[PDB]
RNA sequence: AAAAAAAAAA
RNA sequence: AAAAAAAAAA
RNA sequence: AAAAAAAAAA
RNA sequence: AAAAAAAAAA
RNA sequence: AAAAAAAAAA
RNA sequence: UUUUUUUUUU
RNA sequence: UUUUUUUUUU
RNA sequence: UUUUUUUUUU
RNA sequence: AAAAAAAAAA
RNA sequence: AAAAAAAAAA
RNA sequence: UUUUUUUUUU
RNA sequence: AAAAAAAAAA
RNA sequence: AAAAAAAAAA
RNA sequence: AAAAAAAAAA
RNA sequence: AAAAAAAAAA
RNA sequence: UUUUUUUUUU
RNA sequence: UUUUUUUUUU
């Protein structure tokens, strides 16, 4: 391959956009109660640990949750998880649950076009039960 | 296609990064006198208005220029670019000039894979000559 | 085929959930008087005579409506449907004629996938307006 | 594909039903003491926390049985399901067990076509025994 | 082909809508300041002058823009475009700059299906920035 | 397909036109008496109830018409049309009648395109003749 | 498929057998001390916990050891067979090991065809070695 | 036959 | 790949 | 048509 | 060649 | 697609 | 992608 | 007979 | 190996 | 393989 | 040759 | 889906 | 698809 | 399958 | 024939 | 074309 | 022998 | 990709 600089035959100025969108899935953890639901807010996709902090909506296509931490003594872990929109929360409650107590629960959600809108800090994005203390996510989103 | 909410069976804990890399196509201006040389920093593309500020290094992949204001009297614009590396400045003087006056002069230069490697706030990028007082730059780059 | 109970070798937990979704056509009726449009409420689609009653969000595909009482004397039977929608009521009135005095009328829209977002009971489907004092809906919808 | 609402031609009145039928897969918890067989109730797959609240019929058509809590020290997990019927019950004890003690046990069993009658919530569905204090079960059946 | 009237067998009577739908571009003009940005109402839409003041709601596919007047003394013409969303505003900016001073500088954006709701007069379609005095904008949309 | 917003490439201004032509089919009901013909006058199509009242010519392609009440005692119902143009009146009596007492009675013509020039609002579409006070019209026209 | 009884047209008496043979694999445990051999005797296949009370021999074909309860302290578990046969019993020892200390060991013997004879409840199956306090036996043979 | 630099071409 | 329920389709 | 980054898939 | 609007058709 | 110069190659 | 100049490899 | 949702089997 | 986003080449 | 009765089906 | 139960197998 | 055992059908 | 009336055509 | 309206494309 | 939701399957 | 009942047949 | 108008058959 | 349940289209 080439082994120098190389001159290029540019044209008229190009369409530009210093500012683009970009498909991410962001991973974080949430601290969790027992016996008590978690309102996970999406303003916790904005921030400059994910090189995030330039942007104000986010388009959530997916979430994926897994138990953080161990479960009390004698159980298995599970986490579930209930959509949030802001058009009206959804009554589903996703769960998984761990087959050997020494490995994580996972379980997740697809968000279907039709409910893939722009969504603000302000706005929650699901709700996450479980019974060990911390759930970690990842959420494949498209930040614009 | 699904209008609600589809469970996902989710598995193991995958591979993470909350800081990934980003092909990107930074735009730009700069001042240039008549006559004298103007050294482009590399520092230039690390900045909130690009979404780049979180990066520290960058690998540059090709360079381009275009006129941006009008030439003086009489003339054409043109718009001459000499590379610039650490490891070796080079000798190259890629010029492009209008053949319209009223047009913008553009010219443009590819790094082989032999030179790209990182820059960081502190290198050069290239030196940029021109009559017209100001040069739009757009640089193909990498950020990590 | 089998005739006695058979052994399952089954493995891990799976991912399950207990409250899931249903996409159903709701029949119900409405009273509406002469002259005056009746904005039909969402809320009218979460009931116990639907299994429906554990819903609280709803995602509307199709509404038909048909003419439900006898028209007046001399007159043939009509139903108009207008769509209405929380980003913007539309101003369309689909509009259905009985051919026959004796036979109802019906009509029909379709709600596209860009529209097809969650309501709640305070919300409204579409206005209807009709000579006959009652119009039977049916209207196509996925529960989540 | 379509970005507004469509008129649907409708035709007569169709053939409704706002009470219709549901295949689901319930997932629910009993509490099992040591070396003691607990019938598992048809009543628990009648309620609100299943959406199943409306019917009072169900034609089971698989049971599967997961060990929910950790077995006594020393041991594995082990889960036995003994099928009962209304007609006749059976003396089959399908047994499955763990081979990693951090591991829930699981076992299965098809009820033929000839068996799936109805049952009402006094009816039991079968017997289960473990090692373990709780075990799970997740039932196949159609609610009518 | 015929030369006369001929009969139409027509039978029974049709599904009809008098105020029905409509895909248009409507071209139209605002005022931008120099180094202020204006954000461009959906009212703009709704007038006797496009046919269009019957409807209440749009729904918009894609927006373009030229540069209307000429730059200042020396410089390029150039026109940027923030798509602004009721669900949450976009940070990108569509840049477009004209290669020869005396042609207009124009640029564009799509907006996908998931995010193709309706917008009143209220609303407000996206936010414009130029250094000409006038813009001139045609948006592909759909009335209803 | 695309989640967010994607930048599009325009290039110069387009041919536009803000007051687009429009194929249409508009209802509207007529009073017609016993014995007594009826001038349909073209002004009936351009009315705010069908978005039409921004047009001052409309081409007429075909005519159809439906008994809109019902009939007097002991006969079918029947209606004829006779078309009309200013360049010379037809003599024809397109007649359809009612095979069933209950039910309407429907005829129509096409107009050829030889004869398919503008028509104002004081010029009349067609002579109705009906036994029922009142006849349905669906006119199929370009507005323009 | 037949909905009610049809008639069987049968013919001859035929050749019947009250008590016929079985094929079945026997699942039971035997408890094993440190470093002492434990001889399995045929007389444990014979139960009516097996539905096997009314058989007096067996046709051994294969057998199967795995680990009943948890190995020693820093142990790994493991367990032994020794074939016996009263023609001259085995000096074979097939051991199987855990590779996990959390997990059962197995190991398995198949009897060829030349010495799968009969065996009363008198004799013995095999000598079984283990670490583990109780090992679980399934034992697969023809009874007769 | 492919690859690099300088030049040329549709 | 076939079958059941709920929904949609030619 | 190939390659690079991010995402998604069998 | 495909997608959306209005009209028409088997 | 061919030709020249500098370089690399089977 | 090829022709030519410098160079290299085989 | 297929698409789609819940679920199961492989 | 393809689809999608950013970008370049042609 | 055809025919009859009763039932079910495209 | 297909269906069932029990066992076994790739 | 097959091999084996018990049984049935043809 | 053929025939009848009026018209038009190679 | 063809014709008209509005939108889009090579 | 394709798509959706609930279930079942290799 | 398949399935049920009664009848009939190789 | 076809196209067009009026009309009938299917 | 198919089978079943609800439903739609043809």
């Given at each position: 391959?080439?082994?120098?600089?190389?001159?290029?035959?540019?044209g008229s100025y190009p369409k530009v956009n210093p500012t683009?969108?970009?498909?991410?899935?962001?991973?974080?953890?949430?601290?969790?109660?027992?016996?008590?639901?978690?309102?996970?807010?999406?303003?916790?996709?904005?921030?400059?640990?994910?090189?995030?902090?330039?942007?104000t909506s986010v388009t959530v296509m997916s979430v994926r949750a897994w138990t953080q931490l161990?479960?009390?003594?004698?159980?298995?872990?599970?986490?579930?998880?209930?959509?949030?929109?802001?058009?009206?929360?959804?009554?589903?409650?996703?769960?998984?649950?761990?087959?050997?107590?020494?490995?994580?629960?996972?379980?997740?959600?697809?968000?279907?076009?039709?409910?893939?809108?722009?969504?603000?800090?302000?706005?929650?994005?699901?709700?996450?039960?479980?019974?060990?203390?911390?759930?970690?996510?990842?959420?494949?989103?498209?930040?614009?």
């Open positions: 391959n080439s082994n120098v600089v190389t001159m290029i035959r540019a683009p969108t970009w498909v991410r899935a962001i991973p974080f953890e949430v601290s969790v109660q027992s016996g008590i639901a978690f309102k996970v807010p999406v303003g916790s996709l904005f921030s400059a640990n994910f090189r995030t902090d330039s942007f161990t479960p009390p003594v004698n159980e298995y872990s599970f986490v579930r998880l209930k959509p949030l929109f802001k058009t009206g929360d959804s009554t589903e409650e996703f769960e998984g649950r761990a087959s050997n107590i020494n490995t994580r629960a996972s379980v997740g959600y697809r968000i279907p076009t039709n409910l893939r809108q722009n969504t603000v800090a302000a706005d929650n994005v699901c709700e996450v039960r479980s019974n060990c203390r911390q759930v970690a996510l990842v959420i494949s989103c498209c930040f614009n």
